[PDB]
Amino acid sequence: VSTSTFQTRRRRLKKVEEEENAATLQLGQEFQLKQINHQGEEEELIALNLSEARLVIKEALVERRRAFKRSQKKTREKELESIDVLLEQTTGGNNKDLKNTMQYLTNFSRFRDQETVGAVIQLLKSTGLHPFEVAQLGSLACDTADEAKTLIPSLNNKISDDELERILKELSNLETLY
Amino acid sequence: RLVKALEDIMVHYDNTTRNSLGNVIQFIYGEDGMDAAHIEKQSLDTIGGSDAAFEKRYRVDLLNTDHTLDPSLLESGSEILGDLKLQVLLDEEYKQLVKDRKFLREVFVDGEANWPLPVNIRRIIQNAQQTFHIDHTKPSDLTIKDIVLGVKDLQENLLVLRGKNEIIQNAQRDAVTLFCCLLRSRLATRRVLQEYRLTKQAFDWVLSNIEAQFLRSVVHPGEMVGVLAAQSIGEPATQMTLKKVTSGVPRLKEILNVAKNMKTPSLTVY
Amino acid sequence: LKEKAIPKDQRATTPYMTKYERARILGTRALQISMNAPVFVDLEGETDPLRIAMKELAEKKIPLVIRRYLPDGSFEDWSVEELIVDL
Amino acid sequence: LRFGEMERDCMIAHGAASFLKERLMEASDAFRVHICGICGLMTVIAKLNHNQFECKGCDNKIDIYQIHIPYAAKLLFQELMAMNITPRLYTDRSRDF
Amino acid sequence: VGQQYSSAPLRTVKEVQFGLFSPEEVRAISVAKIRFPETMDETQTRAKIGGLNDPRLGSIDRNLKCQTCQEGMNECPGHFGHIDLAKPVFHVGFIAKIKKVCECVCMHCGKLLLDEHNELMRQALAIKDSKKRFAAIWTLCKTKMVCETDVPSEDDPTQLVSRGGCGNTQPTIRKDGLKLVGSWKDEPELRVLSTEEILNIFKHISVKDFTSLGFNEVFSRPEWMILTCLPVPPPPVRPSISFNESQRGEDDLTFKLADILKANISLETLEHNGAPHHAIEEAESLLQFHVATYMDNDIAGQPQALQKSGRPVKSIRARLKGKEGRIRGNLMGKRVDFSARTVISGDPNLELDQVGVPKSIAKTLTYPEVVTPYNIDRLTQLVRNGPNEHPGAKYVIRDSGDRIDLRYSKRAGDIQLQYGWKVERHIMDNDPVLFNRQPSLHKMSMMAHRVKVIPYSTFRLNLSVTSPYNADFDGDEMNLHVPQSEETRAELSQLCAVPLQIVSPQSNKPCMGIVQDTLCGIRKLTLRDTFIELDQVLNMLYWVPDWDGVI
Amino acid sequence: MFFIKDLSLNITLHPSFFGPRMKQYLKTKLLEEVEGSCTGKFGYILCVLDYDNIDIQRGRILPTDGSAEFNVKYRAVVFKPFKGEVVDGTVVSCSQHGFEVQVGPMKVFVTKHLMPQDLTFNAGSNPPSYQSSEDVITIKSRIRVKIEGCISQVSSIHAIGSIKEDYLGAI
Amino acid sequence: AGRAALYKEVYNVIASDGSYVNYRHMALLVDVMTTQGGLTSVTRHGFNRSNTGALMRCSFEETVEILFEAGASAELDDCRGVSENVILGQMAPIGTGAFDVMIDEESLVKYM
Amino acid sequence: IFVYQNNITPSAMKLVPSIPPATIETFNEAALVVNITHHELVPKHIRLSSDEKRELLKRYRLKESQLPRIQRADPVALYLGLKRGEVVKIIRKSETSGRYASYRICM
Numbered sequence A: 001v002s003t004s005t006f007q008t009r010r011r012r013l014k015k016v017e018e019e020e021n022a023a024t025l026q027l028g029q030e031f032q033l034k035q036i037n038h039q040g041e042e043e044e045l046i047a048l049n050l051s052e053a054r055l056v057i058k059e060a061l062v063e064r065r066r067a068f069k070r071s072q073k074k075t076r077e078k079e080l081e082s083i084d085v086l087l088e089q090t091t092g093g094n095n096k097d098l099k100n101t102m103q104y105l106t107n108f109s110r111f112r113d114q115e116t117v118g119a120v121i122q123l124l125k126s127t128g129l130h131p132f133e134v135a136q137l138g139s140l141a142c143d144t145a146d147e148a149k150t151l152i153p154s155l156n157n158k159i160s161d162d163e164l165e166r167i168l169k170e171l172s173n174l175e176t177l178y
Numbered sequence B: 001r002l003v004k005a006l007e008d009i010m011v012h013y014d015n016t017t018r019n020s021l022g023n024v025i026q027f028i029y030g031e032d033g034m035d036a037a038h039i040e041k042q043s044l045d046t047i048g049g050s051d052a053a054f055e056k057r058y059r060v061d062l063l064n065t066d067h068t069l070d071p072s073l074l075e076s077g078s079e080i081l082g083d084l085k086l087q088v089l090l091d092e093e094y095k096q097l098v099k100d101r102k103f104l105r106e107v108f109v110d111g112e113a114n115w116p117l118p119v120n121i122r123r124i125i126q127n128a129q130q131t132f133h134i135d136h137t138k139p140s141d142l143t144i145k146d147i148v149l150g151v152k153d154l155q156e157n158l159l160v161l162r163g164k165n166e167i168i169q170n171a172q173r174d175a176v177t178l179f180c181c182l183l184r185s186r187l188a189t190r191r192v193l194q195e196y197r198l199t200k201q202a203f204d205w206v207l208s209n210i211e212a213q214f215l216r217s218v219v220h221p222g223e224m225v226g227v228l229a230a231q232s233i234g235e236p237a238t239q240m241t242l243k244k245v246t247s248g249v250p251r252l253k254e255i256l257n258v259a260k261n262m263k264t265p266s267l268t269v270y
Numbered sequence C: 001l002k003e004k005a006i007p008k009d010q011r012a013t014t015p016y017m018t019k020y021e022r023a024r025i026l027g028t029r030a031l032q033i034s035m036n037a038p039v040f041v042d043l044e045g046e047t048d049p050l051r052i053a054m055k056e057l058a059e060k061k062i063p064l065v066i067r068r069y070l071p072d073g074s075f076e077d078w079s080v081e082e083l084i085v086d087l
Numbered sequence D: 001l002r003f004g005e006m007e008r009d010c011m012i013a014h015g016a017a018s019f020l021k022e023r024l025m026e027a028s029d030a031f032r033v034h035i036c037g038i039c040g041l042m043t044v045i046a047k048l049n050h051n052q053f054e055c056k057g058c059d060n061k062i063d064i065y066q067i068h069i070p071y072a073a074k075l076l077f078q079e080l081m082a083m084n085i086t087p088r089l090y091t092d093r094s095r096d097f
Numbered sequence E: 001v002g003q004q005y006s007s008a009p010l011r012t013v014k015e016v017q018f019g020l021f022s023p024e025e026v027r028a029i030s031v032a033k034i035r036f037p038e039t040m041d042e043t044q045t046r047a048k049i050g051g052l053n054d055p056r057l058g059s060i061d062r063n064l065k066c067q068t069c070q071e072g073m074n075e076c077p078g079h080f081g082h083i084d085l086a087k088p089v090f091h092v093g094f095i096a097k098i099k100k101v102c103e104c105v106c107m108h109c110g111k112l113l114l115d116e117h118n119e120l121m122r123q124a125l126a127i128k129d130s131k132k133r134f135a136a137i138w139t140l141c142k143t144k145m146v147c148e149t150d151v152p153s154e155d156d157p158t159q160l161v162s163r164g165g166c167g168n169t170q171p172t173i174r175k176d177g178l179k180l181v182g183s184w185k186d187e188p189e190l191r192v193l194s195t196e197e198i199l200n201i202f203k204h205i206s207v208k209d210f211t212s213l214g215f216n217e218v219f220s221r222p223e224w225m226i227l228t229c230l231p232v233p234p235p236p237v238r239p240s241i242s243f244n245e246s247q248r249g250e251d252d253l254t255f256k257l258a259d260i261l262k263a264n265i266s267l268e269t270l271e272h273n274g275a276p277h278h279a280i281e282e283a284e285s286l287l288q289f290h291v292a293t294y295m296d297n298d299i300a301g302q303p304q305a306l307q308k309s310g311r312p313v314k315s316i317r318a319r320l321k322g323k324e325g326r327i328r329g330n331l332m333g334k335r336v337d338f339s340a341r342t343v344i345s346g347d348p349n350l351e352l353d354q355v356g357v358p359k360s361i362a363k364t365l366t367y368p369e370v371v372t373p374y375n376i377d378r379l380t381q382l383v384r385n386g387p388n389e390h391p392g393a394k395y396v397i398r399d400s401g402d403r404i405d406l407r408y409s410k411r412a413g414d415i416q417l418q419y420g421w422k423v424e425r426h427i428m429d430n431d432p433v434l435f436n437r438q439p440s441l442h443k444m445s446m447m448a449h450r451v452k453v454i455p456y457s458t459f460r461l462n463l464s465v466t467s468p469y470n471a472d473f474d475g476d477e478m479n480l481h482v483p484q485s486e487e488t489r490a491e492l493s494q495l496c497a498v499p500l501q502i503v504s505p506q507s508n509k510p511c512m513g514i515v516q517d518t519l520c521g522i523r524k525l526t527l528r529d530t531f532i533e534l535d536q537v538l539n540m541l542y543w544v545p546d547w548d549g550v551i
Numbered sequence F: 001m002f003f004i005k006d007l008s009l010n011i012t013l014h015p016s017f018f019g020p021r022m023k024q025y026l027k028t029k030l031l032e033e034v035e036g037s038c039t040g041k042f043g044y045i046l047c048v049l050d051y052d053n054i055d056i057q058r059g060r061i062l063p064t065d066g067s068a069e070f071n072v073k074y075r076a077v078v079f080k081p082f083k084g085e086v087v088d089g090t091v092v093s094c095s096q097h098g099f100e101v102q103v104g105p106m107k108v109f110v111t112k113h114l115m116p117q118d119l120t121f122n123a124g125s126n127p128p129s130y131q132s133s134e135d136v137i138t139i140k141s142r143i144r145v146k147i148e149g150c151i152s153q154v155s156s157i158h159a160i161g162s163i164k165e166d167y168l169g170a171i
Numbered sequence G: 001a002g003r004a005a006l007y008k009e010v011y012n013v014i015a016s017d018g019s020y021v022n023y024r025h026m027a028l029l030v031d032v033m034t035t036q037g038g039l040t041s042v043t044r045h046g047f048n049r050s051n052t053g054a055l056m057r058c059s060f061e062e063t064v065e066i067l068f069e070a071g072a073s074a075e076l077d078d079c080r081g082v083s084e085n086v087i088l089g090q091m092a093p094i095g096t097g098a099f100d101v102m103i104d105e106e107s108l109v110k111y112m
Numbered sequence H: 001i002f003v004y005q006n007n008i009t010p011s012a013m014k015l016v017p018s019i020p021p022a023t024i025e026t027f028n029e030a031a032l033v034v035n036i037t038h039h040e041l042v043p044k045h046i047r048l049s050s051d052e053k054r055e056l057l058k059r060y061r062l063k064e065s066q067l068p069r070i071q072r073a074d075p076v077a078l079y080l081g082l083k084r085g086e087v088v089k090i091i092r093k094s095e096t097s098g099r100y101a102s103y104r105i106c107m
């Protein structure tokens, strides 16, 4: 009667396990790499960038707006105003958090096209770097290898500085004009 | 005490009698998988009497003028005279009945005909003779094939255990054994067309009623067989208002407590 | 395990409904009919939820599924429509 | 009136599980406790007016379950607790068997 | 439910994990400190002092308090406390298991007296049943009374290998009521074994040994068998009943607990101050008594903790012991609501499947019905009729769980109904019930009948139905239980009903037949000598309810 | 950062709702109970994806009341922030103590001391701002912040972030 | 042969009173007593020595004691027995409570 | 198999399980005289193979503990030379079925 997951550990009475969550990929019990899909199989962790996320949300809101019409029988600035409208229909005011997240995601959007976002994901998943690193490198607009290995301190020497610079310089070309 | 010792014990969705742990006690409750209340005391006609009286009541010979069924009893009776293909089935029936006689005389030392079994065969016969207005004058239309193959098929439909595999099929076969012997004893080609004089309609109805009444008789998964058994032992032990050996309440507590130091130790040599 | 969900094919459990089963299906269904649950069978002037449930089982218009548990942990899911109420 | 062990026996034999549940709980005794998801003890300080919970010695204001058990059971458990024995109640199993 | 809603998810107990309380865990869970050996009356003020009873634990009066939860007396269970014992003490039940483990392990080092190297030990360690494994291990190493350091190898015995440490001699331990004594060997060193000594040796036992001795490193650690911190039971376990004002009305356990605090304070005092060493162990042996006598008074070692009256004190062990105890007195067998007991009288005009219930029991026993469209009109009329007009109701429970007592309700002659509410109505005719007779020896003694509300004080059952109930009408009393749920009564109808019990599965035959009056009557009636004329025959036909109408 | 997790929810239905379009009310109650809600263990549960392909399942009826326990299995876009996480956001409120930068559904507070030397508070300019020889943080400016600590609350999760370390602050 | 001899005597005691009991009940108690590999007693030293849940075993003769052996052997209660569900005040898996009930979303829309 | 007239010394019997994989069974001369299985109330106990055991537990869906047991030193258990873990399909006579197939595992 609240919100349940899928993975449960053995209640061996003791509690001392919940360690500090750090920059160096120390995610939560649920948030680690080996996430389990609802059908009962292994799945790599899901991590979206500040654009891809907005796209997923916008897709699912359009699909709920449409899912309701079946059962009803028996640039930049324009987007803010369109999102206002869709939200006011798909949600019941309570989602004040989701509405704010929609405004923030549409504001700080790195790439506003599923096409460009796709090409970005192709360029990033090719690293072999962890989903959170992939997502964060996709939401933060860096220019330098030093800037990137500092804002994302999980990198360090998981990737070559020059190679990371090549990825970085490619992202800047992929950038969206408002 | 008895109640407590048998609490957790009940019949499961597989017919196995199990406890709280899940350890098996009885593979198919009561060794037959039948509910106590549906069972009635009947007679096995394949046990007693001389092998001659047995022959007189079960043996059918189409090939012998001094043994053949009179066509006043069977419509196909005049044309049955000689048919070995049919005679081979009569020899199958009679071989099964004789195998039955020797099996029953092996299960019961004394050879008692009277035993508790489901489906009151006695009743259905009378009931058919009431419903179909059976007259012991006009001949029975039935084919000697319709009878023998009707009983052979009925046996195949008398289920207790459904499971597809061998162990289950063999278990089903074992548990139904005694009832199939009684069924064969009362459904022989002499009895069917002489003692009962069943018509095709009456016979086919009788088979359906044996099938339904048997299928109903199977124990119900959830039946608290344990507690029921305990109380079935408890009530007559309470209503116990009582050549020299302890019996009644003393011998009873003696057994329940498994006395290594028994009051009346008796031994009987044959 | 949820693997213990025996397929709709292969069923060692009896096709008939047990006395314990019909009594609980009817009890629960009448209890729901009293919590003002929707009645599928057309009420031939019926006031008593028990009778309503009895007709509901007669017209096989009950939406209930009996999860029969096999001792080992396993289970065979059967419908009220699937089961025979010969009794 | 006493629904004694005798009556218990008979109802079980009959197979009327829901009646016996009613007669043991619902009608007679009846009680609801707030046990911890870590240690199966009635520790959780349920302040249900403002939905505050917490199991001190667990730092658990998250995993709490409400359970329907007779007050004589809450009692039995508290008397076993009183003798230094832990009668831990777990809502979900592991044994299978 | 314990009345009032909580958003906490409702679940069922699917596992019961036993074990021991860790003194650190008792200490952690503890809501109160426990320091005062008194009760209430802080400077004689009718209020519990911050020491024993409600230093947080729980209220003794019709006034809120229970550390931040409160909720009153009802709905809120008691909250535990702690006692810090100046010296540790043995546990009554664990005394023998403590002795057994002491005989199993070497003192000072804390290692098993027996190792894998022994063939019979290998044969023992094979058992994984905690009970049988430990039973084997103790019987095996109770003989060994020297911790072997040097053990002959699985090669040739000429080469002894060091399995462990200390070639120290073990004492022959024997009981003495509350304490243990051992001896080493001219003359045996007969010495007293202290709680502290035993605890440290237990603390030193390796987890391998722990489990291989019939324990568990997580739930039940051998060390915790010796109590350091006592768990203080809250007021619902030890009720204090302040009768209006001028009275106290305490409980047995409360007294024993206060006696423990007395013994503990007297011990602590001698530890800090003047310590004559073997003069202090006097208050320790008394603490040993008080603590063990708080749990069990019906001990073997004679002295029972008698009260200032002569009552040997109601100990926890006695509370739980069955045959009208706790288990068999409150959980296996209990007192119920919606039940009736009156004298039984025989009747030939009723039905087999019925029970004659007096109007006075009908107007008392009540079924809570649901406000449904199918019976909304009937329920509104019962609510009009009230509690005294036979076809009526006693209470009206709303969806909100609020209950209106129809009698003290001044506007109970206008009251409007809305769906899903409950109208607690009188026992209406043809309502199923469980009519049973004590002792319920077999299934049949507990049958489900149909209701027939009749005048005159007795329960009227059918003559033929006395056979499975096994009692005459010589002034026999019978129980009658009211099923509260639609499914509960459905169970009574499709399982427990009188016509279903006709054929007894105890002996595959019927249990009910025609009896006494009806029996001698039917024999005399069935004859070639028995003749009846037209006039009496017409009436004999009319007396058949299911008569075809054909003479 | 934004995760997409597979989650379940135990929704309980009353028999009155056992009418053909039940699935509608189950999906709806799931969206009432979960959408917008924040938890410590999972964070802000923002949006349940694919309204249609939400697992309905067979609902277990209770033996006390006719009510049915359903375990509705879904998938949703979730937001859980962490220490070390570097995220950009927009100012909301400001004081002598510091400014509060809004990141997604949450407010990450930047203390005075978590800002470099030059950054000096000045309320004597409406709206109260922060000054330097290049940087001026006011009402709704864009800042890149490094989260240092998190607080798990009601249907809220807050954080404390620094900007003193390199490549951070105003953008 | 022990199982057999035991039934023979139990039956001879039921017939000593001169009463009748159906084979099944007796064969049941008898097979209960033998399953354990030998002749198992019907007392505190008989059945209360079994592997069965501590809560069930405590409901007969050795209460406090078996509960102390439960807390000592960190015993686990499976909650599959009558007594253990009775103490907990729940629907025991006996009779009516053996199976489970669920509604089908599909069938609910089919009938209307 | 070793047939001893009256007794064997405990100094000798130490050599009984000493030689693997082989098993050394010991039965008294006097105890052999009369056959146990030949008695009226002794039903037929049948030794099972590893595959027969695996199929028995596979079909009924049980654990080894979940099976009825036979003592290791049982007259029929020694007669059959049953080893700890072996199963026997006891086919007996039933006054309500004719035949009943029971199963017992070694202790």
Ligand SMILES: [Zn+2]
Pocket: D036, D037, D038, D039, D043, D055, D057, D058, D060
């Ligand atoms: Zn806890």
Ligand SMILES: [Zn+2]
Pocket: E057, E058, E065, E066, E067, E069, E070, E076, E077, E078, E079
């Ligand atoms: Zn409280």
Ligand SMILES: [Zn+2]
Pocket: E106, E107, E109, E110, E111, E147, E165, E166, E167, E168
């Ligand atoms: Zn040592």
